From a paper:
The four chains were arranged as a dimer of dimers with a butterfly-like shape. The two heterodimers interacted by the C-terminus of nsp16 and as well as the N-terminus of nsp10. We refer to this crystal form as the “large unit cell”. The overall structure of nsp16-nsp10 in the large unit cell was almost identical to the small unit cell structure, including the bound ligands SAM and Zn2+. Alignment of nsp16 from the large unit cell (chains A and C) with that from the small unit cell (chain A) showed substantial similarity with a raw root-mean-square deviation (r.m.s.d.) of 0.37 Å and 0.42 Å, respectively. The introduction of a flexibility factor in the alignment showed an optimized r.m.s.d. of 0.38 Å for chain A and 0.77 Å for chain C, demonstrating that the nsp16 structures in these two crystal forms are similar but have flexible regions. One of these flexible regions was a part of the loop formed by the residues Asp6931-Phe6947, which was disordered from the residues Lys6933 to Lys6939 in chain C, a likely explanation for the structural differences. There are only minor conformational differences for loop 1 of nsp16, however, the L8–η-3–L9 loop showed a more “open” conformation in the large unit cell and a more “closed” conformation for the small unit cell structure when only SAM was bound. Thus, the heterodimer is the most soluble and stable form of the 2-O-MTase complex, and the dimer of dimers in the large unit cell formed as a result of crystal packing.
Numbering used by the authors:
A (entry chain B): 4271 to 4392
B (entry chain A): 6800 to 7096
Write the structure that this text describes.
């Protein structure tokens, strides 16, 4: 039943004042992208930075199994868009946040699926 | 001014000279480009290399096969691989490799000496950033180097599809005469210097459209001396300007034809198509690769 909880350990480390994982690979891009969370190519908007996904994955970086039966990674081989205010800790951002399964935007950082109904626009 | 270009390619006239080798002494040595905020030098360097490769007649088939040697770093990540995967069409297969373990965005990663890498398939593009740190720890008479370069020469002659291309990193001291000779086996070639790293003797030897035979007999010792003469006499201004316009960065998916022709069917019409980046000659079998494991107590 024993299972190493790397996610919780990194969050406790950060809460204690630990230095965030570094050398996440930031990409050059136009910053005129869709703003979606995880994409096949950099899609940062004006308020985000795009990073190589593998470099922002706690499991890839710590050389630990991915927390799922198949051991599949949703970041490796893709690009993750991180809000500029959180670009100092992309690993911590991907762990603490969830991608909306409907619009593909981060919950609380792009997803507008839960906003009051807009009046219809011509 | 060449400051708004991604870098500078060695003018063709240098290839026809017969210079004596001597020290590479760069006027702009020590200088540094203004890297965009939080951008690693290798992301900037690979971005400029890819910006320049976009201007060449690269074959870009569907299901393109790319192998990247020297993709690791002391950081434990693969900045260059992340740029290649951004640059290449999403359907391209990307395999990378390095002597030391690292975390990568490549489809597959092989750890170990490149001499331990095996593959039953041909590749469409070979990128190498391999460099031995002992090249600067002890300076030696500048002779042709025979470590990973011997493997690269063999890999080009056995595992590169006709019409395929290469970008192999060299420096004043990290070079190989046989690799320059192999540049004569491509429809065209050059030595490309990224503007962000123009203060270094580094260059990428780019072979464009592999013909599988020599169109020109090149003396590698003389050609490296010609390269040094160019670097010593035409200073390149450090510049990061091309990094700020990424609008036309992605490699265009040309959908280049791939055919499995025999060595006895390669005529002048075929060589002409290969030379224009309009044809890739190789089988399209399951891409299989591996790295030897040395077993001992
Ligand atoms: C300049 S570093 C590569 C930096 C990397 N391209 C990046 O994107 O940051 C050169 C690399 O060549 C690798 N290398 C040197 N000799 C090698 C060999 N014989 N086989 C494989 N890799 C080798 C080193 O381990 C080192 O990681
Ligand atoms: Na911050
Ligand atoms: Na891409
Ligand atoms: Zn991962
Ligand atoms: Zn949503």
């Amino acid at each position: 039943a024993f299972a190493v909880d790397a996610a919780k350990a990194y969050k406790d480390y950060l809460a204690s004042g630990g230095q965030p994982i570094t050398n996440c690979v930031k990409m050059l891009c136009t910053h005129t992208g869709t703003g979606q969370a995880i994409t096949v190519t950099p899609e940062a908007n004006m308020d985000q930075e795009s990073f190589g996904g593998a470099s922002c994955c706690l499991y890839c970086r710590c050389h630990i199994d991915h927390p799922n039966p198949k051991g599949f990674c949703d970041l490796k081989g893709k690009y993750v868009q991180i809000p500029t205010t959180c670009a100092n800790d992309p690993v911590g951002f991907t762990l603490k946040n969830t991608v909306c399964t409907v619009c593909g935007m981060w919950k609380g950082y792009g997803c507008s699926c839960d906003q009051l109904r807009e009046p219809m626009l011509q | 001014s060449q400051a708004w270009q991604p870098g500078v390619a060695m003018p063709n006239l240098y290839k026809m000279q017969r210079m004596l080798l001597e020290k590479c002494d760069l006027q702009n040595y020590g200088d540094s480009a203004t890297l965009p905020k939080g951008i690693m030098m290798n992301v900037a360097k690979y971005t400029q290399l890819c910006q320049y490769l976009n201007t060449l007649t690269l074959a870009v088939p569907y299901n393109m096969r790319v192998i990247h040697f020297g993709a690791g770093s002391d950081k434990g990540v693969a900045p260059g691989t992340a740029v290649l995967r951004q640059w290449l069409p999403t359907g391209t297969l990307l395999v990378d490799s390095d002597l030391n373990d690292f975390v990568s965005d490549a489809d597959s990663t092989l750890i170990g000496d490149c001499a331990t890498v095996h593959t039953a398939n041909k590749w469409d593009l070979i990128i190498s950033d391999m460099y031995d740190p002992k090249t600067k720890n002890v300076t030696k008479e500048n002779d042709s180097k025979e470590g990973f370069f011997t493997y690269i020469c063999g890999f080009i002659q056995q595992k590169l599809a006709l019409g395929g291309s290469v970008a192999i990193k060299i420096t004043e001291h990290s070079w190989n005469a046989d690799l320059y000779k192999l540049m004569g086996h491509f429809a065209w070639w050059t030595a490309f210097v990224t503007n962000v790293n123009a203060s270094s003797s580094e260059a990428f030897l780019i072979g464009c459209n592999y013909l599988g035979k020599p169109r020109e007999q090149i003396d590698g010792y003389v050609m490296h001396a010609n390269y040094i003469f160019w670097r010593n006499t035409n200073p390149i201004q450090l510049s990061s300007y091309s990094l700020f316009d990424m609008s036309k960065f992605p490699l265009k998916l040309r959908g280049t034809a791939v055919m499995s022709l025999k060595e006895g069917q390669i005529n002048d019409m075929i060589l002409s198509l290969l030379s224009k980046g309009r044809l890739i000659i190789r089988e399209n079998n399951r891409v299989v690769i591996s790295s030897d494991v040395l077993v001992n107590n």
